[PDB]
């Protein structure tokens, strides 16, 4: 069995503290075992050089745990969230993210996207409220997953720091709710997968995902619509 | 048809360079298309504090264009070849791989790959044969290249960097002779993609890796056995 | 009246929140008002080059917020725990303290060291308990807060973001139970106090400080002897 | 008796030498004991992003020595300078300070505040000369010193590099001629003091502070009328 | 005699590679001995800050090796550019330097002066001919060259590396073909050199400055007049 | 004539305050017309990791003013004074030598390097008096000074501030009371000059630099012997 004590396909226990620290526009504290990160997000009346003039909003993301890889999964994050909206029916803004790790154990970079995104729904949706911008930008739900392999294990899903310390093959993926893919990313440690392998990964992904999406829609529910 | 006048599954005309300059053990011209990319390979005696006293080996790469992903490629080149290299085998060294692109036309970070390995291999068939280590360390021939989709032209293999810039979908694939996976990352620019679409892409990815691990064979030959 | 609604020598709600998160040996989330800082409470069987052979441990400190000051702050936090730990009888190891404002709203520095001291008070106490020392090292209790002086408000008391911004003169104590001083700092923006300002403050901080610690003895209780 | 060889109320000899180096508007070369700190003051017509446009000048100082305190020390300057002076009276306009500490022996910080008022003074008395602002913009004379407690010596007033190493408790205190507080700052290694500890301490300063400024106006004289 | 196997006054085979790459305008791989430097060159409608409005080109180089010298490197090769080109006659416009070591051996940093002219020259040849400037900016050639003393061996011109590390007073001359200096740099590693010895320096540095420049005019010939 | 008033060939007013601070083995206050640099020497039993067991001592520089040339003058200083040094003869040793501008009106680098020779001398001949290496290290004496050519002035010695910023071609040399080069480095601003400029340039900076050891000589006198 698994050491966490679950099985192959079972995600470690999810939880969404909606409203964390009242400052932010939306602020969200999302949990997945041990792994705790506090996903905030932003409304300015702004726009980077990139645009200001163009009419379509921004999102930018920022990330810091407990400067390589810092980067890295700063465009990660919002480049996944900028895939599920609509910036130009956001109009000229930039929607500021910020994923800070309070305790890490695994997956978190998968869950920042799926906690940041919460947090940008619900800065979004009050926007919509207040009437500041009246047609609903978030055109499908977002959430990332962490897969491996394991010598002795075999495919998990969900993995915590030392089952991806040991695993020789792990991968990140980033869906929407209609089942599509906005990023993956999977590589071998002094090992190599076949295609049969990558297959029950995206497989086991897509379940974590949708279990993922599903909760987001139960504990958002009223503060957005679509 | 496609911009550059080729197919849909078509490589770029790929040339490989033997011996560019006689410094390092190993040095690779790889050409695909307008892209041009030196690859050198070098060895010393001695490894980073990571081992030193292990007995296994180590591979290490550079690269320069004409630093954020710097660093992220660099490590990919590095984690790619050490997935077809049994650092022990290779005894206690350090293979420095240096990929520095001359022209970039898409497909920068795919064809160091490619090219590093070749170089690699030159280098430590030279190491091989004076007898220095006697024993092939080398497990399988590797190779990478890129796929993507275009709104208008549908899937893609081998995009140059116009295609790649209007690609909503692209992804970076890298495997061995066994037709095995090293490391694959696909991405969406507001854009996302089937389960089904992926399936298209890999097998693009494995076309065209086989052609170029086939290339690499009839180039390298009695410069390694295996 | 105050614009927080309280009176002059009044303190901001204020609650201590035990075991934030699992992993340190001490975690505290202290809350004044608006203001959230979570900090948290490490040892370390090491110590720097400072010592090393020399019997006594150490204490250091790291903070972040939502480079210049932080140095600063950084090192005042570490200098206040010192002054009331005999660092011989802690052992010579190493206590790392985390301070991680999650949410500024006036007074993050000072509430930084009172939060603090119960998070190194809670992971000294196991040490005591699972006999790895026993010896309490703690020799008092420390608080810190702020006060200040506005123009047409007067002598304050736990300054929150805005009437800190107003105050023409503000100063940070920390003291120990036994009402002796660690640390005090106070400044006058474009604007000086008299001799008779200064007493109102320090009386201030002290009835202030001498809250904090009452609390922290409340709330601390069994998880350290004294 | 002090290793000095001076009193426990006793300040090290003290001189101003006025106008050091002919260049900046006003330049004074501050010697306490074995401590020297050239302090030198500019004028610019001109202001930062703050204001340019407010009407307000602005004081701004920069400190070096034989770069986290540097920075903090560097605040000081100017916070305590701007306390004295009118910026409106002195008009859209910026009085750089620099101070060069060319020999520490302790108090250097507090003898930059002492001779950069000086400076200032001077080559703000030679703008009203000059008639390019025509109203005495200083407000108040401006002197610190340093004090602190020894295990053995007890308090001490004006502390040396050897005495305050020593000192289980220094203080650095600023006041105006009016016998106002600017900032005080005290601090305890590894020891506390008590309320009456600081009243003493208090009354040093003030004793050091009054001496310094009564210096300061016999040498100032003619060079500025208040 | 030499260990390269040539004379004291005698230049190592140099070879000038025309159109290296496609991209640049101007693309030169210049080669001297084992030194191999590829110098790229291209022409931008724009000006930094500096200018813009201004009317006159501008000329910036960049520098890279197999970065405290880097920096030094890169101004010398734009100052020595600059010193032949009359940034009027050339219009509004800044031409991208690059030059990009692909294996040194001594004389690196001359190299990259000396083929860089002919790139900028070859760039500038095809901007007279698009008649998109109609008069040409390049006032003379411009070529470098390093010479020095060694213990045994005496006065040497063009050092390779190993002649260059053993040299007890190596010096960097730049010339134009009119014989005029637009830089000279000497200097003697734990060792001086009389004014007789850097007469002869001088003297060999124009002997080989002029052979380089009558190869530059043999090989630009047709690609620009003047 | 010349805006300082004087003529060609001509040295403006130099003065060297010895023991300028107490603390430094070696203290030097230069002056040269309107620049000021104090020039301090101290000595360090201790060797960076370069030797360490080698025998031979070193000399480090430090440089500052009222990053990317400080750090270039920083060695050059270093580089001017080993050149006259016999680091074997001065034994496992560290000079460090501070060279901190307090004035700067052109050739402050070139003084730094007479001052700093100075104070190194007076440190060292104290060494040798405490007999604390009964051996002198120093081979001759150094000083440094710059040359340019201005287009309606002509050539120029000692340049100031003004004369260095309208000078077409400006220069510094560094030699040794023997009348041998350490360094030299000329450069052309928008500007070249021939061989019979370079020439002259030598020639005055021999008169000037002979002119600065020769006052070098009757003020250091009987604090060194050679």
Redesign the interface.
């Known amino acids: 069995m698994r050491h966490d004590g679950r099985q192959h396909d079972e995600l470690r226990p999810i939880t969404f503290d909606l409203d ?4 932010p526009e939306g602020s969200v504290l999302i949990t997945a075992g ?1 792994t ?1 990160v ?1 996903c905030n997000a932003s409304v300015e009346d702004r726009v980077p050089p990139f645009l200001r003039g163009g009419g379509k909003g921004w999102i930018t993301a920022e990330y ?1 745990m ?1 400067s ?1 890889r810092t ?2 999964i700063q465009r990660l994050i919002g ?1 996944a969230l ?2 599920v909206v609509d910036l130009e029916k956001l109009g000229e803004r930039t929607i500021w993210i ?1 994923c ?1 790790v ?2 890490a ?1 695994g997956g978190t970079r998968t869950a920042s996207i799926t906690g940041a995104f919460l947090a940008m729904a619900i800065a979004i949706g009050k926007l919509i409220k207040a009437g500041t911008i009246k047609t609903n930008p978030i055109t499908d739900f977002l959430a990332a997953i962490s897969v491996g392999i394991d010598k002795e294990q075999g495919i998990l899903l969900d993995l915590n720091y030392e089952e991806d310390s040991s695993a020789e093959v792990d991968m990140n993926v980033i ?2 709710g ?18 049969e ?2 297959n029950g990964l ?1 497989g086991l992904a ?1 379940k974590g995902i949708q279990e993922l999406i599903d909760k987001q829609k139960e504990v958002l529910g009223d503060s957005l619509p679509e």
Do not use: P, W, Y
Not at 20 to 23: A, E, G, Q
């Open positions: 964390f620290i009242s400052h041990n705790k506090i810091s407990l390589g980067m890295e480049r900028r895939a910020d800070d309070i305790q154990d869906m929407t209609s089942g599509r893919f906005v990023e993956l990313q999977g590589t071998g440690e002094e090992a190599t997968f076949s295609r392998d990558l995206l897509e």
